[PDB]
Amino acid sequence: SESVTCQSFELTLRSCLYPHIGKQYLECCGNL
Amino acid sequence: ENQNVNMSRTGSILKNQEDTFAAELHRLKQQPLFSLVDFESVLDRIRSTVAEHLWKLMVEESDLLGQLKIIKDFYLLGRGELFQAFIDVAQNMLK
């Protein structure tokens, strides 16, 4: 949409990747 | 951020106040100038709606009114008889 409402920028995407890691780190330990 | 993410003050995982915050961001960046009233009247809105949601947090999780009369009864000694039996016994072996 707009850049200035998306602020800013790369630590928000990185804090999206850590639950993407997390949804495998949380589901592996259930199987262990 | 430490304990639990649905316990946030602004409303960040659990509410939609941060999209109101996004609207505030849209309002405050395109302005080329700066003054005092426009900056500080919306310093209310990032504070006041945030200052009430944590008040509506700690009422229900704790029974607020419980321990905050209990902790005063231990220090200002509201239960007056309930410590004198301690004082009578603690006198005879603090000698």
Side-chain angles (χ1 to χ4, degrees):
Chain A
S1 61
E2 182 59 43
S3 159
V4 78
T5 195
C6 182
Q7 293 288 102
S8 91
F9 273 114
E10 58 276 350
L11 72 164
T12 74
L13 312 183
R14 273 190 303 258
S15 63
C16 201
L17 295 192
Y18 310 143
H20 297 345
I21 298 307
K23 78 213 178 189
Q24 175 74 247
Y25 157 70
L26 271 300
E27 78 192 347
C28 62
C29 307
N31 304 332
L32 268 298
Chain B
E1 183 73 274
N2 192 4
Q3 191 72 62
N4 206 330
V5 298
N6 265 13
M7 304 318 142
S8 131
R9 211 185 143 173
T10 78
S12 101
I13 296 341
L14 73 157
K15 294 195 303 177
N16 58 347
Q17 296 295 297
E18 84 285 350
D19 77 42
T20 95
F21 300 156
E24 194 316 292
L25 263 261
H26 282 131
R27 39 217 208 44
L28 230 58
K29 181 63 186 257
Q30 91 282 30
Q31 181 65 32
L33 274 300
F34 176 73
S35 78
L36 275 296
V37 179
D38 192 7
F39 180 48
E40 292 219 20
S41 64
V42 309
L43 280 168
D44 196 51
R45 204 49 60 192
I46 189 55
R47 194 155 48 85
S48 47
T49 70
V50 185
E52 52 90 17
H53 180 248
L54 84 168
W55 204 90
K56 306 314 287 166
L57 163 57
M58 54 188 311
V59 163
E60 283 79 12
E61 60 94 10
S62 55
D63 179 13
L64 274 191
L65 271 283
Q67 59 89 27
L68 78 79
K69 62 167 299 310
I70 292 314
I71 189 169
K72 314 318 295 195
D73 282 338
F74 279 140
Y75 278 121
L76 174 49
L77 191 43
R79 291 167 179 271
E81 202 185 311
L82 285 73
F83 278 42
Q84 179 57 57
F86 160 67
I87 280 161
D88 287 324
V89 178
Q91 170 62 272
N92 289 347
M93 57 161 140
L94 274 173
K95 293 293 288 184

Short mmCIF file of all heavy atoms in Angstrom, two decimals, chain B residues 25-82:
data_model
loop_
_atom_site.label_atom_id
_atom_site.label_comp_id
_atom_site.label_asym_id
_atom_site.label_seq_id
_atom_site.Cartn_x
_atom_site.Cartn_y
_atom_site.Cartn_z
N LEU B 25 0.60 7.47 11.78
CA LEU B 25 1.88 7.56 11.04
C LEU B 25 1.62 8.23 9.68
O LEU B 25 2.42 9.12 9.30
CB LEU B 25 2.45 6.15 10.87
CG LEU B 25 3.51 5.75 11.90
CD1 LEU B 25 4.91 5.92 11.33
CD2 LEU B 25 3.35 6.56 13.17
N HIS B 26 0.53 7.85 9.02
CA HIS B 26 0.17 8.46 7.71
C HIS B 26 -0.07 9.96 7.89
O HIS B 26 0.40 10.74 7.04
CB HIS B 26 -1.06 7.76 7.12
CG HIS B 26 -0.76 6.45 6.49
ND1 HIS B 26 -1.49 5.31 6.76
CD2 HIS B 26 0.20 6.08 5.60
CE1 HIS B 26 -1.00 4.30 6.07
NE2 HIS B 26 0.03 4.75 5.35
N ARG B 27 -0.77 10.35 8.97
CA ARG B 27 -1.04 11.80 9.24
C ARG B 27 0.25 12.58 9.55
O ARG B 27 0.25 13.80 9.29
CB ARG B 27 -2.20 12.05 10.21
CG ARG B 27 -2.30 11.09 11.38
CD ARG B 27 -3.75 10.78 11.71
NE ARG B 27 -3.97 10.43 13.11
CZ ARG B 27 -3.44 11.08 14.14
NH1 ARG B 27 -2.65 12.11 13.93
NH2 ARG B 27 -3.71 10.68 15.37
N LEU B 28 1.25 11.95 10.17
CA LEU B 28 2.35 12.76 10.77
C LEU B 28 3.62 12.84 9.91
O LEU B 28 4.58 13.53 10.34
CB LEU B 28 2.64 12.26 12.19
CG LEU B 28 2.69 13.34 13.27
CD1 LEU B 28 1.36 14.10 13.33
CD2 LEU B 28 3.02 12.75 14.62
N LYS B 29 3.67 12.19 8.73
CA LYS B 29 4.93 12.18 8.00
C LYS B 29 4.96 13.13 6.81
O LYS B 29 5.99 13.76 6.57
CB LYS B 29 5.25 10.75 7.53
CG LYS B 29 6.55 10.60 6.76
CD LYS B 29 7.73 10.95 7.65
CE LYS B 29 9.04 10.94 6.88
NZ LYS B 29 9.85 9.72 7.16
N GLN B 30 3.84 13.27 6.09
CA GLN B 30 3.77 14.13 4.91
C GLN B 30 3.87 15.61 5.24
O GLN B 30 4.08 16.41 4.32
CB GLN B 30 2.46 13.85 4.15
CG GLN B 30 1.25 14.72 4.56
CD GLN B 30 0.56 14.30 5.85
OE1 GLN B 30 1.18 13.76 6.77
NE2 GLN B 30 -0.74 14.55 5.92
N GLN B 31 3.71 15.99 6.50
CA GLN B 31 3.85 17.38 6.92
C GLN B 31 5.29 17.83 6.78
O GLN B 31 6.17 17.25 7.43
CB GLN B 31 3.38 17.55 8.36
CG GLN B 31 3.45 18.97 8.89
CD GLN B 31 2.52 19.92 8.16
OE1 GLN B 31 1.44 19.54 7.71
NE2 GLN B 31 2.93 21.18 8.05
N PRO B 32 5.59 18.84 5.96
CA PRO B 32 6.98 19.29 5.82
C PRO B 32 7.46 20.13 6.99
O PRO B 32 8.67 20.21 7.22
CB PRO B 32 6.97 20.10 4.53
CG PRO B 32 5.57 20.62 4.44
CD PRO B 32 4.67 19.61 5.09
N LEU B 33 6.55 20.75 7.73
CA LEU B 33 6.89 21.65 8.82
C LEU B 33 6.78 20.92 10.15
O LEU B 33 6.55 19.71 10.22
CB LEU B 33 6.00 22.90 8.80
CG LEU B 33 6.37 24.11 7.92
CD1 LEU B 33 7.72 24.68 8.34
CD2 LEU B 33 6.32 23.82 6.43
N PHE B 34 6.93 21.67 11.24
CA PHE B 34 6.78 21.13 12.58
C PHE B 34 6.24 22.21 13.50
O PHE B 34 6.68 23.37 13.43
CB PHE B 34 8.11 20.59 13.13
CG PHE B 34 8.03 20.11 14.54
CD1 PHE B 34 7.39 18.92 14.84
CD2 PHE B 34 8.58 20.84 15.59
CE1 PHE B 34 7.30 18.46 16.15
CE2 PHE B 34 8.49 20.40 16.89
CZ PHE B 34 7.85 19.20 17.17
N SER B 35 5.31 21.83 14.37
CA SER B 35 4.88 22.70 15.45
C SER B 35 4.64 21.85 16.68
O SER B 35 4.93 20.65 16.71
CB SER B 35 3.61 23.48 15.08
OG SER B 35 2.45 22.68 15.19
N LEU B 36 4.10 22.49 17.71
CA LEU B 36 4.04 21.87 19.03
C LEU B 36 2.69 21.22 19.28
O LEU B 36 2.61 20.15 19.89
CB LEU B 36 4.35 22.92 20.11
CG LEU B 36 5.80 23.26 20.50
CD1 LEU B 36 6.51 22.06 21.11
CD2 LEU B 36 6.64 23.84 19.36
N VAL B 37 1.61 21.86 18.80
CA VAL B 37 0.26 21.41 19.13
C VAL B 37 -0.10 20.16 18.34
O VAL B 37 -0.71 19.23 18.88
CB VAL B 37 -0.74 22.56 18.89
CG1 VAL B 37 -2.17 22.12 19.20
CG2 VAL B 37 -0.37 23.78 19.72
N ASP B 38 0.28 20.12 17.06
CA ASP B 38 -0.05 18.96 16.23
C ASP B 38 0.75 17.74 16.65
O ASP B 38 0.26 16.61 16.55
CB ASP B 38 0.21 19.30 14.75
CG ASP B 38 -0.38 18.28 13.78
OD1 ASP B 38 -1.12 17.37 14.20
OD2 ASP B 38 -0.09 18.40 12.57
N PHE B 39 1.97 17.94 17.15
CA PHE B 39 2.77 16.82 17.61
C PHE B 39 2.26 16.27 18.94
O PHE B 39 2.25 15.05 19.14
CB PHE B 39 4.24 17.24 17.74
CG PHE B 39 5.15 16.14 18.20
CD1 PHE B 39 5.11 14.88 17.62
CD2 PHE B 39 6.07 16.37 19.22
CE1 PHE B 39 5.95 13.87 18.04
CE2 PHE B 39 6.92 15.36 19.65
CZ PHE B 39 6.86 14.11 19.06
N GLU B 40 1.79 17.14 19.84
CA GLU B 40 1.46 16.72 21.19
C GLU B 40 0.00 16.36 21.40
O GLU B 40 -0.32 15.68 22.39
CB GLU B 40 1.85 17.82 22.19
CG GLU B 40 3.35 18.02 22.33
CD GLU B 40 3.77 18.29 23.76
OE1 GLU B 40 2.99 17.96 24.68
OE2 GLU B 40 4.87 18.83 23.97
N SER B 41 -0.91 16.81 20.53
CA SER B 41 -2.31 16.40 20.66
C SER B 41 -2.51 14.94 20.28
O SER B 41 -3.43 14.30 20.80
CB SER B 41 -3.21 17.28 19.79
OG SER B 41 -2.91 17.12 18.42
N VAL B 42 -1.66 14.40 19.41
CA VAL B 42 -1.67 12.99 19.06
C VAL B 42 -0.64 12.21 19.85
O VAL B 42 -0.54 10.99 19.69
CB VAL B 42 -1.49 12.80 17.55
CG1 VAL B 42 -2.47 13.67 16.78
CG2 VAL B 42 -0.07 13.15 17.15
N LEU B 43 0.13 12.88 20.71
CA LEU B 43 0.82 12.18 21.78
C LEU B 43 -0.14 11.73 22.87
O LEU B 43 0.20 10.84 23.66
CB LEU B 43 1.93 13.05 22.38
CG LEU B 43 3.24 13.08 21.58
CD1 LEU B 43 4.17 14.19 22.06
CD2 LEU B 43 3.94 11.73 21.66
N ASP B 44 -1.34 12.33 22.93
CA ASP B 44 -2.43 11.77 23.71
C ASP B 44 -2.86 10.41 23.19
O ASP B 44 -3.03 9.46 23.96
CB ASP B 44 -3.63 12.71 23.69
CG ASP B 44 -4.65 12.39 24.77
OD1 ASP B 44 -4.26 12.26 25.95
OD2 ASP B 44 -5.84 12.22 24.41
N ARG B 45 -3.05 10.31 21.87
CA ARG B 45 -3.68 9.13 21.29
C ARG B 45 -2.78 7.91 21.32
O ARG B 45 -3.29 6.78 21.38
CB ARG B 45 -4.12 9.44 19.86
CG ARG B 45 -5.25 8.55 19.35
CD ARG B 45 -6.41 8.49 20.35
NE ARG B 45 -7.00 9.80 20.61
CZ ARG B 45 -7.86 10.05 21.60
NH1 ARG B 45 -8.23 9.07 22.42
NH2 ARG B 45 -8.34 11.27 21.77
N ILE B 46 -1.46 8.10 21.30
CA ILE B 46 -0.52 7.01 21.53
C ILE B 46 -0.33 6.74 23.02
O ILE B 46 0.30 5.74 23.40
CB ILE B 46 0.79 7.36 20.76
CG1 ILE B 46 1.80 6.21 20.71
CG2 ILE B 46 1.45 8.58 21.35
CD1 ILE B 46 1.26 4.93 20.15
N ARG B 47 -0.89 7.57 23.89
CA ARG B 47 -0.81 7.32 25.32
C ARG B 47 -2.13 6.88 25.94
O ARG B 47 -2.17 5.86 26.63
CB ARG B 47 -0.27 8.55 26.06
CG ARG B 47 0.16 8.26 27.49
CD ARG B 47 1.20 9.26 27.98
NE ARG B 47 0.80 10.64 27.70
CZ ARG B 47 0.01 11.37 28.48
NH1 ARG B 47 -0.47 10.85 29.61
NH2 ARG B 47 -0.30 12.61 28.14
N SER B 48 -3.22 7.61 25.66
CA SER B 48 -4.44 7.49 26.48
C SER B 48 -5.17 6.17 26.23
O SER B 48 -5.61 5.51 27.18
CB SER B 48 -5.37 8.67 26.20
OG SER B 48 -5.52 8.88 24.81
N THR B 49 -5.31 5.77 24.97
CA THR B 49 -5.91 4.46 24.67
C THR B 49 -4.98 3.33 25.09
O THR B 49 -5.44 2.22 25.37
CB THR B 49 -6.23 4.35 23.18
OG1 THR B 49 -5.02 4.26 22.43
CG2 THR B 49 -7.02 5.57 22.72
N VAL B 50 -3.68 3.59 25.13
CA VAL B 50 -2.72 2.63 25.65
C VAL B 50 -2.73 2.62 27.18
O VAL B 50 -2.52 1.58 27.80
CB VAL B 50 -1.34 2.95 25.05
CG1 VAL B 50 -0.31 1.92 25.45
CG2 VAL B 50 -1.45 2.99 23.54
N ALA B 51 -3.01 3.76 27.81
CA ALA B 51 -3.01 3.83 29.27
C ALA B 51 -4.27 3.26 29.91
O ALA B 51 -4.34 3.18 31.13
CB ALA B 51 -2.83 5.27 29.75
N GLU B 52 -5.28 2.88 29.11
CA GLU B 52 -6.48 2.28 29.68
C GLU B 52 -6.55 0.77 29.48
O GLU B 52 -7.23 0.10 30.26
CB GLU B 52 -7.74 2.93 29.09
CG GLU B 52 -7.80 2.98 27.56
CD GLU B 52 -8.45 1.75 26.95
OE1 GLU B 52 -9.14 1.01 27.69
OE2 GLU B 52 -8.28 1.53 25.74
N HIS B 53 -5.86 0.24 28.47
CA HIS B 53 -5.99 -1.18 28.17
C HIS B 53 -5.24 -2.03 29.19
O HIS B 53 -5.68 -3.13 29.53
CB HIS B 53 -5.49 -1.46 26.75
CG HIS B 53 -5.59 -2.90 26.36
ND1 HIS B 53 -4.48 -3.70 26.15
CD2 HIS B 53 -6.67 -3.70 26.13
CE1 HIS B 53 -4.88 -4.92 25.81
NE2 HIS B 53 -6.19 -4.94 25.79
N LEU B 54 -4.10 -1.54 29.70
CA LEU B 54 -3.43 -2.26 30.77
C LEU B 54 -4.13 -2.08 32.10
O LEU B 54 -3.93 -2.89 33.01
CB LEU B 54 -1.97 -1.82 30.92
CG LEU B 54 -1.60 -0.57 31.74
CD1 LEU B 54 -0.10 -0.52 31.97
CD2 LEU B 54 -2.07 0.71 31.08
N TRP B 55 -4.94 -1.02 32.25
CA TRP B 55 -5.81 -0.93 33.42
C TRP B 55 -6.91 -1.98 33.35
O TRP B 55 -7.30 -2.55 34.37
CB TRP B 55 -6.41 0.47 33.52
CG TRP B 55 -6.81 0.81 34.92
CD1 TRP B 55 -6.04 1.41 35.87
CD2 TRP B 55 -8.07 0.52 35.54
NE1 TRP B 55 -6.75 1.55 37.04
CE2 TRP B 55 -8.00 1.00 36.87
CE3 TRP B 55 -9.25 -0.09 35.11
CZ2 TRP B 55 -9.06 0.89 37.76
CZ3 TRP B 55 -10.31 -0.19 36.00
CH2 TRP B 55 -10.20 0.29 37.31
N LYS B 56 -7.41 -2.26 32.14
CA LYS B 56 -8.35 -3.35 31.94
C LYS B 56 -7.67 -4.71 31.83
O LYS B 56 -8.37 -5.72 31.66
CB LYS B 56 -9.20 -3.10 30.68
CG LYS B 56 -9.92 -1.75 30.63
CD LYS B 56 -10.63 -1.39 31.93
CE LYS B 56 -11.88 -2.22 32.15
NZ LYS B 56 -12.38 -2.10 33.55
N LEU B 57 -6.34 -4.76 31.88
CA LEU B 57 -5.62 -6.02 31.99
C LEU B 57 -5.63 -6.52 33.42
O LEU B 57 -6.15 -7.60 33.71
CB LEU B 57 -4.18 -5.85 31.49
CG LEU B 57 -3.09 -6.89 31.84
CD1 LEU B 57 -3.42 -8.31 31.40
CD2 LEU B 57 -1.74 -6.44 31.28
N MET B 58 -5.06 -5.73 34.33
CA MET B 58 -4.65 -6.24 35.62
C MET B 58 -5.80 -6.34 36.62
O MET B 58 -5.60 -6.91 37.70
CB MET B 58 -3.49 -5.39 36.15
CG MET B 58 -3.74 -3.90 36.22
SD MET B 58 -2.24 -2.97 36.63
CE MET B 58 -1.61 -3.86 38.05
N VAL B 59 -6.99 -5.84 36.27
CA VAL B 59 -8.18 -6.04 37.10
C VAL B 59 -8.57 -7.51 37.14
O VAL B 59 -8.77 -8.09 38.21
CB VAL B 59 -9.34 -5.16 36.59
CG1 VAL B 59 -10.68 -5.64 37.14
CG2 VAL B 59 -9.11 -3.70 36.93
N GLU B 60 -8.65 -8.14 35.97
CA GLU B 60 -9.21 -9.48 35.85
C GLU B 60 -8.20 -10.59 36.15
O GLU B 60 -8.59 -11.63 36.68
CB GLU B 60 -9.78 -9.69 34.45
CG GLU B 60 -11.14 -9.02 34.21
CD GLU B 60 -11.03 -7.53 33.93
OE1 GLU B 60 -9.91 -7.05 33.70
OE2 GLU B 60 -12.08 -6.85 33.94
N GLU B 61 -6.92 -10.40 35.81
CA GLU B 61 -5.93 -11.44 36.03
C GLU B 61 -5.56 -11.61 37.49
O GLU B 61 -5.08 -12.69 37.87
CB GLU B 61 -4.66 -11.15 35.21
CG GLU B 61 -3.95 -9.84 35.54
CD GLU B 61 -2.84 -9.97 36.58
OE1 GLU B 61 -2.46 -11.11 36.91
OE2 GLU B 61 -2.35 -8.93 37.05
N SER B 62 -5.77 -10.60 38.32
CA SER B 62 -5.21 -10.61 39.66
C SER B 62 -6.23 -10.47 40.78
O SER B 62 -5.89 -10.85 41.91
CB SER B 62 -4.18 -9.48 39.82
OG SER B 62 -4.75 -8.22 39.48
N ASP B 63 -7.45 -9.99 40.49
CA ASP B 63 -8.34 -9.37 41.47
C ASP B 63 -7.52 -8.28 42.15
O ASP B 63 -7.01 -8.53 43.25
CB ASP B 63 -8.93 -10.37 42.49
CG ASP B 63 -9.85 -9.71 43.53
OD1 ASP B 63 -10.26 -8.53 43.37
OD2 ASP B 63 -10.11 -10.36 44.56
N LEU B 64 -7.25 -7.18 41.41
CA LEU B 64 -6.51 -6.01 41.89
C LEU B 64 -6.79 -5.65 43.33
O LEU B 64 -5.88 -5.62 44.17
CB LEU B 64 -6.81 -4.77 41.05
CG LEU B 64 -6.05 -4.47 39.77
CD1 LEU B 64 -6.36 -3.06 39.30
CD2 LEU B 64 -4.58 -4.64 40.03
N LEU B 65 -8.07 -5.46 43.64
CA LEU B 65 -8.53 -4.99 44.94
C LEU B 65 -8.20 -5.95 46.08
O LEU B 65 -8.24 -5.55 47.25
CB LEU B 65 -10.04 -4.74 44.89
CG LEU B 65 -10.63 -3.39 44.45
CD1 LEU B 65 -10.55 -2.33 45.55
CD2 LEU B 65 -10.06 -2.85 43.12
N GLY B 66 -7.85 -7.20 45.76
CA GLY B 66 -7.41 -8.17 46.74
C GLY B 66 -6.07 -7.84 47.37
O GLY B 66 -6.05 -7.41 48.52
N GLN B 67 -4.95 -7.98 46.64
CA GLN B 67 -3.64 -7.88 47.28
C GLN B 67 -3.29 -6.46 47.70
O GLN B 67 -2.50 -6.29 48.64
CB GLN B 67 -2.53 -8.43 46.36
CG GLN B 67 -2.36 -7.76 45.00
CD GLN B 67 -1.40 -6.58 45.04
OE1 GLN B 67 -0.50 -6.54 45.88
NE2 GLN B 67 -1.61 -5.60 44.17
N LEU B 68 -3.87 -5.46 47.04
CA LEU B 68 -3.59 -4.06 47.35
C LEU B 68 -4.39 -3.52 48.52
O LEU B 68 -4.27 -2.33 48.84
CB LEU B 68 -3.76 -3.22 46.06
CG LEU B 68 -5.07 -2.73 45.40
CD1 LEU B 68 -5.73 -1.50 46.01
CD2 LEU B 68 -4.84 -2.51 43.90
N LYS B 69 -5.20 -4.35 49.19
CA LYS B 69 -5.50 -4.12 50.60
C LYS B 69 -4.74 -5.09 51.50
O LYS B 69 -4.65 -4.84 52.71
CB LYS B 69 -7.00 -4.25 50.91
CG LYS B 69 -7.60 -5.62 50.64
CD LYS B 69 -8.99 -5.79 51.23
CE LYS B 69 -8.95 -5.64 52.75
NZ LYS B 69 -7.88 -6.48 53.37
N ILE B 70 -4.20 -6.17 50.95
CA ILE B 70 -3.50 -7.17 51.76
C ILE B 70 -2.10 -6.66 52.10
O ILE B 70 -1.65 -6.76 53.25
CB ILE B 70 -3.45 -8.52 51.04
CG1 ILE B 70 -4.84 -9.14 50.92
CG2 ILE B 70 -2.58 -9.53 51.78
CD1 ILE B 70 -5.68 -9.10 52.17
N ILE B 71 -1.42 -6.06 51.12
CA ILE B 71 -0.04 -5.59 51.30
C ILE B 71 0.00 -4.39 52.24
O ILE B 71 1.00 -4.16 52.93
CB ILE B 71 0.59 -5.30 49.91
CG1 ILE B 71 2.09 -5.01 50.01
CG2 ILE B 71 -0.10 -4.14 49.20
CD1 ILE B 71 2.78 -4.99 48.65
N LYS B 72 -1.08 -3.62 52.31
CA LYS B 72 -1.15 -2.52 53.27
C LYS B 72 -1.44 -3.02 54.67
O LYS B 72 -1.03 -2.40 55.65
CB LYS B 72 -2.21 -1.50 52.84
CG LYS B 72 -2.26 -1.05 51.36
CD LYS B 72 -0.90 -0.77 50.69
CE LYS B 72 -0.18 0.42 51.31
NZ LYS B 72 0.93 0.91 50.45
N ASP B 73 -2.14 -4.15 54.78
CA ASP B 73 -2.42 -4.75 56.08
C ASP B 73 -1.19 -5.39 56.69
O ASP B 73 -1.13 -5.56 57.91
CB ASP B 73 -3.55 -5.77 55.95
CG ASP B 73 -4.91 -5.12 55.87
OD1 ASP B 73 -5.05 -3.96 56.31
OD2 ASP B 73 -5.86 -5.77 55.37
N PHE B 74 -0.20 -5.77 55.87
CA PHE B 74 1.05 -6.28 56.40
C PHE B 74 1.99 -5.18 56.85
O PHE B 74 2.81 -5.40 57.74
CB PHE B 74 1.76 -7.15 55.36
CG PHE B 74 1.23 -8.55 55.28
CD1 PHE B 74 1.08 -9.19 54.06
CD2 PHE B 74 0.90 -9.24 56.44
CE1 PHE B 74 0.60 -10.48 53.99
CE2 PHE B 74 0.42 -10.54 56.38
CZ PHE B 74 0.27 -11.16 55.16
N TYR B 75 1.89 -3.99 56.26
CA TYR B 75 2.85 -2.92 56.52
C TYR B 75 2.31 -1.86 57.46
O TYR B 75 2.98 -1.47 58.42
CB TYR B 75 3.29 -2.29 55.20
CG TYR B 75 4.37 -3.08 54.49
CD1 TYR B 75 4.16 -3.58 53.21
CD2 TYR B 75 5.59 -3.33 55.10
CE1 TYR B 75 5.14 -4.31 52.56
CE2 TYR B 75 6.58 -4.05 54.46
CZ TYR B 75 6.35 -4.53 53.19
OH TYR B 75 7.33 -5.27 52.55
N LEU B 76 1.09 -1.37 57.21
CA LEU B 76 0.43 -0.40 58.07
C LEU B 76 -0.32 -1.09 59.21
O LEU B 76 -0.88 -0.41 60.08
CB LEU B 76 -0.49 0.48 57.21
CG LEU B 76 -1.50 1.56 57.64
CD1 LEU B 76 -0.89 2.54 58.63
CD2 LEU B 76 -2.03 2.30 56.43
N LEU B 77 -0.30 -2.43 59.23
CA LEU B 77 -0.81 -3.27 60.33
C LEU B 77 -2.31 -3.07 60.54
O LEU B 77 -2.77 -2.58 61.57
CB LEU B 77 0.00 -3.03 61.62
CG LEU B 77 -0.13 -3.93 62.85
CD1 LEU B 77 -0.16 -5.37 62.41
CD2 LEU B 77 1.06 -3.68 63.75
N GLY B 78 -3.08 -3.44 59.51
CA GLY B 78 -4.53 -3.41 59.63
C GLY B 78 -5.07 -4.54 60.48
O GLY B 78 -6.03 -4.35 61.24
N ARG B 79 -4.48 -5.72 60.37
CA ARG B 79 -4.83 -6.86 61.23
C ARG B 79 -3.99 -6.75 62.50
O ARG B 79 -2.90 -7.31 62.62
CB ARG B 79 -4.60 -8.17 60.49
CG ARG B 79 -5.58 -8.41 59.35
CD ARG B 79 -5.14 -9.56 58.45
NE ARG B 79 -6.09 -9.80 57.37
CZ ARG B 79 -7.13 -10.62 57.46
NH1 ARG B 79 -7.36 -11.28 58.58
NH2 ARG B 79 -7.94 -10.78 56.42
N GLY B 80 -4.52 -5.98 63.46
CA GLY B 80 -3.71 -5.56 64.59
C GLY B 80 -3.48 -6.66 65.61
O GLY B 80 -2.38 -6.80 66.16
N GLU B 81 -4.52 -7.45 65.90
CA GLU B 81 -4.37 -8.57 66.82
C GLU B 81 -3.50 -9.67 66.24
O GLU B 81 -2.82 -10.39 66.99
CB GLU B 81 -5.73 -9.14 67.19
CG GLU B 81 -5.73 -9.91 68.49
CD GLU B 81 -7.06 -10.56 68.77
OE1 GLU B 81 -8.10 -9.89 68.65
OE2 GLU B 81 -7.06 -11.77 69.07
N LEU B 82 -3.51 -9.82 64.92
CA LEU B 82 -2.87 -10.95 64.26
C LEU B 82 -1.35 -10.86 64.24
O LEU B 82 -0.70 -11.83 63.84
CB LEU B 82 -3.41 -11.10 62.83
CG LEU B 82 -4.82 -11.67 62.58
CD1 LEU B 82 -5.98 -10.74 62.95
CD2 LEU B 82 -4.95 -12.15 61.14
#
